[PDB]
């Protein structure tokens, strides 16, 4: 099915994931510099923090485009997927894969740990929130 992005539940979902955006944009520099492998004391937290950003990747395939040229709506399936797969699907999926598990179980290399800085991209969600307050 298709859900219009106004029915008081998708907006509550986006506001819920904005909390994770604040957490994951402030914790990413804290584990790249200080920690060097993310010890097991917070192993569950790392896995749990990427679940909220993984369901949204498969839950953003049910939205309304509005087509940006004829402001009525878009409800077809091919249009939604082609829109998302062209804009930010590659960077959202890439910033969701576990890099701490890959880094340690790869003959630990510091080069492969620089991919954590990709996860800093999701601070743009907080910037988009401030734009809505201006309007």
């Amino acid at each position: 099915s298709i859900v219009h992005p106004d029915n008081r539940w998708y907006k509550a979902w986006t506001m819920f994931i904005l909390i994770w955006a604040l957490y994951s944009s402030f914790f990413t520099p804290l584990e790249f510099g200080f920690f060097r492998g993310l010890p097991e004391n917070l192993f569950i937290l790392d896995i749990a923090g990427q679940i909220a950003f993984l369901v949204d990747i498969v839950l953003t395939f049910f939205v309304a485009y509005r087509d940006s040229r004829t402001y009525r709506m878009i409800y077809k399936r091919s249009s939604i997927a082609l829109r998302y797969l062209k804009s930010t699907f590659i960077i959202d999926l890439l910033a969701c894969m576990p890099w701490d598990i890959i880094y340690k179980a790869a003959g630990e290399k510091e080069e492969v740990r620089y991919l954590l800085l990709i996860r800093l991209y999701r601070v743009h969600r907080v910037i988009l929130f401030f734009h809505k307050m201006e309007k």
């Binding site: 040229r69 004829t70 402001y71 009525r72 201006e134 309007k135």
Partner: protein, 399 residues
């Protein structure tokens, strides 16, 4: 260059100047350390310098690439007015240079802030949009407008927020003569494709492009209602409309022309289906243009046919009656002796020599009422004197 903003370019110029003076001041500062003998290197800013473990003892063979960064690190910290104290001047000749570099940069630093403010003070799309909504919300609250209307007025303001509009109160500085040519370049291709204006003269069509206005409508809005009196004529140039579903409106079409010609109330409701751009024409402006182009007016009615017979008969009757009506107006003015009233309908009206349905030259009424002054003017037009009505009389017989 007009492609890029000039205020933003001025900001980049000041940053380059400030970062270049920092580079120059770093090279000069190291020179003031080498102008002392090597035996007195303990009195220099770098010779006596000692970081965490490094000593900077020799100071003259220190792998230049790590001798320039230390000097540049001093200059950047001073330029930004941060201040650490790990690197500082010690002798007399380095204090004097520091005073003139710090004082010079203080003026330059406050100059960057001044140009940064001027960039912001110009405004933005969000700032201008926010001001408009403040007035509209205040205007609607005091008049207690309905909630349905408030959803339309606020909708159109967000429509022009993105996809920047023509930016009104700016194009008004353009003279009307120049703007007249601008309208032809833009609106002509859309008008020529309508079925109503097929075969019309170029002179007639040109008189319509000058007095057109462009408007946008969001999907779901209603322009005309069933049974309403049409006061505007709309040309569809973009988007799609649905007439209520009994018909679908495509671009390069016109709707509402039936009501404005036969004086019939609008029979169908037009509904916006997608974002559309519409050109509108007023009723008063349309009829004034149509009256002058009498020959073109007949073609419009004929093209519309391809109630229809009644409209066609009325159109042929409308053009037949207007020639007789103007004759009556001139005779009435001459009967009451209003010289100024009849003057307007002579230079841009009808022929005074013509007679009405019964046959009444203005000389007949003038001679019957003894108005000497009006008689002089009719002589200037060389109006025939021996014109006879359907009675055998002459204008001289009334005097």
């Amino acid at each position: 260059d007009i492609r890029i903003n000039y205020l933003f370019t001025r900001i980049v110029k000041l940053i380059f100047v400030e970062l270049y003076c920092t580079h120059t001041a770093a090279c000069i500062f190291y020179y003031l350390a080498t102008t002392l003998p090597a035996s007195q290197e303990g009195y220099t800013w770098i010779g006596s310098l000692k970081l965490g473990d490094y000593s900077y003892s020799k100071f003259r063979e220190i792998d230049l690439w790590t001798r320039y960064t230390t000097s540049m690190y001093f200059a950047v910290v001073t330029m930004a007015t941060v201040g650490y104290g790990d690197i500082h001047a010690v002798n007399m000749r380095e204090m004097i240079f520091a005073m003139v570099y710090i004082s010079f940069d203080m003026i330059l630093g406050a100059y960057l802030i001044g140009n940064m403010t001027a960039l912001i003070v110009k405004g933005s799309k969000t700032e201008r949009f926010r001001d408009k909504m403040a007035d509209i919300m205040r205007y609607m609250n005091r008049n207690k407008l309905g909630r349905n209307i408030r959803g339309q007025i606020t909708g159109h303001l967000r429509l022009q927020y993105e996809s920047s509009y023509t930016e009104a109160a700016v194009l008004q500085d353009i003279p009307v003569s120049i703007r007249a040519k601008i309208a032809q370049t833009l609106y002509l291709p859309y008008i020529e494709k309508v079925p109503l204006f097929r075969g019309c003269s170029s002179e007639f069509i040109n008189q319509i492009v000058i007095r057109l206005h462009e408007e946008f409508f969001l999907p779901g809005e209603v322009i005309m209602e069933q049974g309403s009196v049409v006061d505007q004529l709309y040309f569809v140039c973009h988007g799609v409309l649905e007439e209520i579903i009994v018909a679908v409106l495509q671009p390069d079409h016109s709707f509402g022309e039936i009501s404005i010609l036969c004086n019939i109330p609008q029979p169908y409701t037009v509904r916006v289906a997608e974002l559309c751009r519409i050109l509108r024409l007023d009723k008063q402006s349309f009829m004034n243009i149509l009256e002058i182009f009498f020959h073109d007016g007949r073609r419009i009615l004929n093209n519309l046919l391809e109630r229809i017979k009644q409209l066609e008969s009325d159109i042929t009757f409308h053009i037949s009656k207007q020639e007789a009506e103007l004759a009556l107006k001139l005779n009435s003015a001459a009967f009451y002796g209003d010289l100024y009233q009849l003057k307007s309908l002579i230079r841009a009206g009808g022929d005074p020599n013509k007679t009405d349905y019964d046959g009444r030259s203005p000389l007949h009424l003038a001679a019957s009422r003894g108005y000497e002054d009006i008689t002089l003017y009719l002589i200037q037009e060389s109006v025939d004197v021996n014109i006879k009505d359907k009675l055998g009389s002459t204008p001289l017989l009334e005097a």
